[PDB]
Each structure stands twice: as structure tokens, then as C-alpha cells.
Design a protein around this ligand. Structure first.
Ligand SMILES: Nc1ncnc2c1ncn2[C@@H]1O[C@H](COP(=O)(O)OP(=O)(O)NP(=O)(O)O)[C@@H](O)[C@H]1O
Ligand SMILES: Nc1ncnc2c1ncn2[C@@H]1O[C@H](COP(=O)(O)OP(=O)(O)NP(=O)(O)O)[C@@H](O)[C@H]1O
Ligand SMILES: Nc1ncnc2c1ncn2[C@@H]1O[C@H](COP(=O)(O)OP(=O)(O)NP(=O)(O)O)[C@@H](O)[C@H]1O
Ligand SMILES: Nc1ncnc2c1ncn2[C@@H]1O[C@H](COP(=O)(O)OP(=O)(O)NP(=O)(O)O)[C@@H](O)[C@H]1O
Ligand SMILES: O=C(CO)Nc1ccc(CC(=O)N2CCN(c3ccc(Cl)nn3)CC2)cc1
Ligand SMILES: O=C(CO)Nc1ccc(CC(=O)N2CCN(c3ccc(Cl)nn3)CC2)cc1
Ligand SMILES: [Mg+2]
Ligand SMILES: [Mg+2]
Ligand SMILES: [Mg+2]
Ligand SMILES: [Mg+2]
Lengths: 352, 352
């Protein structure tokens, strides 16, 4: 009876929950206590246990969905804590996607009579992205870009219209990265992927700096100087490599100055965090750029929770895509970037 | 008077030296002592100081070059030790390439009357590669591939003919990576590059494991299990991701299992070395694959010293390029992979 969409990823579980707000007096009297209890629990708390979080700022208010009016809520928790979620569930038609819909299928079925319907991770991403952009973010644009990304004194977030979204390159930066070429609502292909994704940032940062959370990793990176770890073009040439138009500030070898023992002994944890962020972000941007050129698509939208509270990586992607494509490609971002699969899963409910 | 070609890279200096073997009795009597001394020093030693090495197995014997017969020698030492080389030189027309031809221009000119001619790093690579393949490796093929790279019990190095080499994708894995599309002897373009190169392997390995040399890093990696650090598709799905044909053994997130503290505490240095090698190698293979598809080139040749004494990375590239391209791309390798720029520089001598 509760309407939920769940994307169980390699690192995070994302949950979309539709709260009806048009409940009649008869419906309110004839609702079972468990349904009332779950609605009150979800809507009266913003932290769930020790690791679940409701992203209240993303709530879609007064959405019409399946012929009812309600609020669409966005909730996340680590996949490592899915056993706690399932145990709480054992104290419903669940549309679930991501790899964990398969990996934990038998675990979900320990919840009596619960009906699990597995839906494809990338199908749900595409459907949820198109849907959220179509309904708007409470009347504001769901999509944005960074204007004048080449100039810091001018670089500013600006809304971007996706009313005719096709074709579109979707770069899903999760634990790993999948890249999709979307030609229509039902015509898309996974062009390629890269294993240098959000989990590489977090795993390498944890090994190199001892950080204990994604947010701590980003805080460290904001204070660091990646050029203390990276070997730049100017470190090899003494300047630009002019014949091929490579600026002296371009990174020639990520972590390449760490082959020298005395440099390893002077580099800070913050420098290493920033070099990890820069390395992973530039590699994703470069793969995206190559895929867009081969697919002949000039709109590249980045999603996934690697970019959550991560304006550094977003601006780097905006600048780098514009710079290296000589202005032919535009980096786009979405306000509900990590939740599209969960929404797409919820949208599959009528098919069951 | 001595004939040398020098490629001063971000990490290694490569030197090609042509030893004449057709010296007449008159020439031998009328040669200055310094020229005799340098020839004897170079040809009677295989280690030079504490860090220079002559790769004797690569010697081209009885080569005809500029109308003389001689032996072509291949010598390498760290760029960090170039001050020792220049000081020894102060105790000649030098064609020099790589970034260090520019960075250390003024240093070379401290050698009295020495004439430095700077040549382009990638021009020299192309010219040297085409030349060495044209003269053969003492009658054997300069180019090879790994036959049946998908099967370990069959996978074996085999010679490969490059007599009509065009078009060709050249992947130069140095400190960083440059990728060239070669359409003719004088028509090529730098398609792109990646900063995740040999210096990323060596720098990250040194930070993660404390290894003190490239060879130690490879020895560690040969003993490790990268899947202890990497998060695989099967770690996310419990198996294959069948809808997109992604095998369960494919890496979904490099270092992605290192987000868990207990896994960081159990992983070995050897596992981390191997994960670094696998991560860097697969990323280079993937970028090469995307560039070959966009350039419509099916022969991809890998050069640079990242692959020196590194059969692990070569076989991984051979397997991965064949697997992910569904057999449409072939990984090629060259016996003199790190020295092509130095040879191309030496070949510029007649122009001065
Ligand atoms: N093609 C079918 N026609 C009728 N009944 C079926 C069919 N396939 C399976 N069943 C039965 O109905 C049950 C539920 O089927 P189904 O609707 O496919 O849900 P599910 O497999 O649990 N989740 P999902 O496959 O991801 O949508 C199965 O456990 C079978 O006992
Ligand atoms: N609170 C957090 N905890 C962990 N990782 C976070 C957190 N916030 C942001 N991240 C980043 O978000 C990434 C996960 O993004 P996400 O899109 O949720 O992937 P996923 O769906 O769990 N993995 P996948 O199976 O590859 O699609 C992590 O790799 C981190 O870089
Ligand atoms: N176009 C020119 N015509 C005549 N003489 C020149 C010219 N350019 C420079 N010179 C002089 O000749 C010297 C050597 O010139 P050149 O042959 O270009 O060698 P280089 O600059 O030292 N090395 P490179 O430029 O990399 O080949 C310079 O230091 C000038 O004094
Ligand atoms: N003895 C060694 N010392 C250091 N690195 C080595 C050694 N042997 C192999 N390597 C590897 O070879 C890579 C350097 O390859 P090389 O083709 O010589 O680059 P480079 O020309 O010095 N750099 P670049 O300026 O980017 O072209 C290093 O990053 C290591 O991965
Ligand atoms: O994170 C999730 C959640 O489902 N999935 C997921 C994310 C990323 C991947 C990696 C991937 O797709 N690639 C990396 C390896 N690539 C190579 C390697 C060598 C060569 Cl030569 N060519 N290509 C093929 C493409 C896989 C799965
Ligand atoms: O090692 C030597 C010796 O000369 N040179 C050398 C080797 C490698 C490089 C790196 C490089 O070329 N690239 C990396 C950054 N790329 C991006 C980044 C973001 C985006 Cl969005 N697009 N592309 C452009 C291509 C540079 C120089
Ligand atoms: Mg995901
Ligand atoms: Mg079924
Ligand atoms: Mg080089
Ligand atoms: Mg000059």
C-alpha cells in the first residue's frame, strides 16, 4: 500500500516515497495502523536511525502521481545498512532497481507477502530523469549549468531548459560510472563506463588520508593543492607544450610528483585528497568528452552521488568540458542527481 | 662528432648512440682522445655511474645509418640525474627531444660549443617507430602481439608485420599518456591524452605500499590480488549485470572496496600494488579503445616505458582490448618501446 521506489546501489540505497496529501476522512478512518505508523515515521523524522537521511530540500510538494496528489520524498542510507532496513521491515509492492535488487532479492522476500519487482538500473535512471525534469522542481528548473565556467569571478549556477532533451549523454557517477546515449524516451544505449568512479575517490582518499566519510574527504580536498602531488606539463617542459596546445598548468601525470621520496614526505593529506578528487573528476570528464564526440551529442548531463555537496567537482567538470572541447560541449547538472533510479522504479508501479 | 639522439622525458632520459664499426686505419689515427674515450666508456660498460643502464639486448648490430655501418645502442637514466650527465659532459651536435629539451636547454648550453637542436617529442616518436620497424630488430620482427590473449594456456607472444603501418593508433605510456592517430609518415594528430599514466602507477604505488622502485612495484603487483581492493560487478549484483553484458568479474569501482575500514585493515601491500596496476592499465586500454573507434583505426600499438619488463600490463591490455572490442581491435607492442623518441631525434641529425 505505501508507494516506494528503491535503488539499491553498490554504495548507497536511494528511496523515493510518495506521501498522499489528499487522504479523505473515510480513507483516514479505514487505514491500518501500520500504514499510519510508517507515514508518520517517515514524515516526522529527517534522520532515520543512525545512518538514514531525508533530503528535505529535494521534496516535490503537491505532485500529482497515479491520479493522487502528494509529496515526493527522497531518502538515502548506506547499502551496508540494508539489513537494518529489512529487519525494521519485518517488525507492499516494492519496485526495486540497482544491483542490490538482484543481490538482495532473497532478503527482501523475508518480509512476508511483500512483492518484489526488479527493474533495470539504467532504464529506471532514464525514466526518472525525464520524469523529474518534466514535472519541474516545484516550478524551478531541475537542470542547471555553470555560466562562464572559464572565469571564476563570473562562474555561476544558472537554470537550463531540457524540454526537448534528446539526444542526451547521461554520465552516471556512482560507485562506478556508466555513460548512456539517450536518443528518445525508449531508445538509449550504454556507450561505455569507467571503473574510476565515486568509489575510487572515496576508497583512495580513505587509504591516503585516513578520512572516515565522503564529506570529510571533500573538506580535506577543499583545503588542498593538487599540484603538490601531480606532475604538470610545466614540470616536464618548463612551460606550455605549445606545438599541441597543452597549457603548462595541465596535469601530465596524476600523482606523478609522488615518485620522489622527499615530495611524498612533504605532501599533506589535504593535498592528496584534492589530487584524488581532481584525478577522478578529470578522467570522468575526459571519457564523457570522448563519448559525446563519438556519439555526436553536445549536451552532457552528470548525475550520481559523487557530485552530492561537491561543487568543486561540478565546477571542474564545467570548466574542463568547455575548455578541452573548445566550447563545443556543455556540462549539465540536475538537482535530484542521485535519486533518478529510485523515481524510475516508483514509476513502474502501475505495471504490476 | 659522436652521434647521439636524446629524449628527456618527465621521468626518464633515453639516449640512442650510434657506434661506428667501419672506422678506417686513418680515421683511428686521426681521432681525438676524447672521442676515443667516450666510445670506449659507452661500449665497455653496461652500467654508467649508479643509475645509467645500457639495454644491451636491444642493440641493433651492423646498422647502416647516414652511410656508415655501426651498432645502435640504447641507454637510459633518470631525468633527476641529468645534472650528473651534464657535469660529466663538461669534464657535438645534440638532437634532443621530450619536454626536457626545452626545460634544460640552458643547462645543455653550459657544455662549451655544444649545439643543441630541439625536436618535437611526438614527431620524434613517430619517426623513430617507423624507422626501427623498417630496419627490423636484427632480422626479427620489431612488432609483436599476444595470440589467443583470451586464454592463458594459449596466450603467447607472436611477431606481427607492420610493413604497411598506416593507419595506426600509437599509445605512448610515459609519465603521462599521449595518443596519436598516424595516417602517413608525415600526417598524424594527437587525438587526446590521459594523465593517468606510468607516473600515476609509480606515484600511487609508492604512497600506498612504500615501494622504492618501479621494479619493486611490479614485483609486489605480481603477488597481489586486485579484487581485494576493487569492487566488482558481482559485488554489486551478486553476479553478472546481464542486460548490458557486463561480466561479474568486471571491475565496477577501482579501489571501491577500500571504503570499508575493515577491508582497508586486511588488504596487503601486494594487493594494493596490483589494484593500482590493473586500474591504470584498464583505463589506458579503455581510452585507447574509445580513440580507435572514433578514429576508425583497428591497430593500436602501445609504447613507452610503463610497459618495460611489465608482461602483466601487456597481457592485460591484449586481453582487455580484444574482449571489450569484441575482437575488433588488436593490441600491438614493440621491442624498443621506450626508445623511439631518442631514435627519431638522432634521425634529425642530417638537417643540421
Ligand atoms: N510467467 C508467469 N506466469 C504466471 N505465474 C508466474 C509466472 N512466472 C512466475 N510466476 C509465479 O508467480 C510468482 C511471482 O512472479 P513475478 O510477478 O514474476 O514476481 P517476481 O519474480 O517475484 N519479481 P520480478 O520478476 O522482478 O518482477 C513466482 O514466484 C511464480 O510462483
Ligand atoms: N554519504 C555518502 N556515503 C558514501 N558515499 C557518498 C555519500 N555521499 C556521496 N557519496 C558519493 O556518492 C558515490 C555513490 O553514488 P551513487 O550514485 O549513490 O552510487 P551507487 O548507486 O550506490 N553505486 P552503483 O551501483 O555503481 O550505481 C560514492 O562513491 C561517493 O563518491
Ligand atoms: N634564422 C636565423 N638565421 C641565422 N642565424 C640565426 C637564426 N636564428 C638564430 N640564429 C643565430 O644562430 C644561433 C643558433 O641558432 P639555431 O640553429 O636555431 O640553434 P638553437 O636555437 O640553439 N637550437 P634549435 O632552435 O632547437 O634548433 C642562435 O643563437 C642565433 O645567434
Ligand atoms: N627504471 C624506471 N624508473 C622509473 N620509471 C620506470 C622505470 N622503468 C619503467 N618505468 C615506467 O616508465 C614510465 C616512464 O616512461 P617513459 O616513456 O620513459 O616516460 P617519460 O618520457 O620519462 N615521460 P613523458 O614526459 O610523459 O613522455 C614511468 O612512469 C614508470 O611507470
Ligand atoms: O557501477 C555500476 C552499477 O551497475 N556498474 C558498472 C560501472 C562501471 C563499469 C566499468 C565499465 O563499464 N568499463 C570499464 C572497463 N572497460 C574497458 C576496460 C578495458 C578496455 Cl580495453 N576497454 N574497456 C569497459 C567499460 C562496470 C559496471
Ligand atoms: O606526458 C607528456 C609528455 O609531453 N604529456 C602529456 C600527457 C598527458 C596529458 C593529459 C592530456 O592530454 N589530457 C588529460 C586531460 N584531458 C581532459 C580533461 C578533462 C576533459 Cl573534460 N577533457 N580532457 C585532456 C587530455 C598532457 C600532457
Ligand atoms: Mg547507482
Ligand atoms: Mg520473476
Ligand atoms: Mg616520453
Ligand atoms: Mg633556435
Amino acid at each position: 500500500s505505501p508507494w516506494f521506489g528503491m535503488d539499491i546501489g553498490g554504495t548507497l540505497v536511494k528511496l523515493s516515497y510518495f506521501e498522499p496529501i489528499d487522504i479523505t476522512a473515510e480513507e483516514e478512518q479505514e487505514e491500518v495502523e501500520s500504514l499510519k505508523s510508517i507515514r508518520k515515521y517517515l514524515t516526522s523524522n529527517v534522520a532515520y536511525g543512525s545512518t538514514g537521511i531525508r533530503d528535505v530540500h529535494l521534496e516535490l510538494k503537491d505532485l500529482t502521481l497515479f491520479g493522487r496528489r502528494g509529496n515526493l520524498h527522497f531518502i538515502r542510507f548506506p547499502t551496508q545498512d540494508l539489513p537494518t532496513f529489512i529487519q525494521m521491515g519485518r517488525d507492499t509492492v516494492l519496485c526495486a532497481t540497482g544491483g542490490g535488487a538482484y543481490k538482495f532479492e532473497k532478503d527482501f522476500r523475508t518480509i512476508g507477502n511483500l512483492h518484489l519487482h526488479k527493474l533495470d538500473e539504467l532504464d529506471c535512471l532514464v525514466k526518472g530523469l525525464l520524469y523529474i525534469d518534466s514535472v519541474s522542481f516545484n516550478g524551478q528548473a531541475e537542470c542547471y549549468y555553470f555560466a562562464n565556467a572559464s572565469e571564476p569571478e563570473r562562474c555561476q549556477k544558472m537554470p537550463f531548459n531540457l524540454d526537448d532533451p534528446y539526444p542526451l549523454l547521461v554520465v552516471n557517477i556512482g560507485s562506478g560510472v556508466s555513460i548512456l546515449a539517450v536518443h528518445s524516451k525508449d531508445n538509449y544505449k550504454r556507450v561505455t563506463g569507467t571503473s574510476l568512479g565515486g568509489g575510487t575517490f572515496l576508497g583512495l582518499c580513505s587509504l591516503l588520508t585516513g578520512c572516515e566519510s565522503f564529506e570529510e574527504a571533500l573538506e580535506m580536498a577543499s583545503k588542498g593543492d593538487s599540484t603538490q602531488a601531480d606532475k604538470l606539463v610545466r614540470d616536464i617542459y618548463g612551460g606550455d607544450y605549445e606545438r599541441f596546445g597543452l597549457p603548462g598548468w595541465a596535469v601530465a601525470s596524476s600523482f606523478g610528483n609522488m615518485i620522489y621520496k622527499e615530495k611524498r614526505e612533504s605532501v599533506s593529506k589535504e593535498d592528496l585528497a584534492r589530487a584524488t578528487l581532481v584525478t577522478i573528476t578529470n578522467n570522468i570528464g575526459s571519457v564523457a568528452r570522448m563519448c559525446a564526440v563519438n556519439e555526436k551529442i553536445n549536451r552532457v548531463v552528470f548525475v550520481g552521488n559523487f557530485l552530492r555537496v561537491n561543487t568543486l567537482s561540478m565546477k571542474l567538470l564545467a570548466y574542463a568540458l568547455d575548455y578541452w572541447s573548445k566550447g563545443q560541449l556543455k556540462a549539465l547538472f540536475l538537482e535530484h542527481e542521485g535519486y533518478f533510479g529510485a523515481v524510475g522504479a516508483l514509476l513502474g508501479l502501475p505495471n504490476f
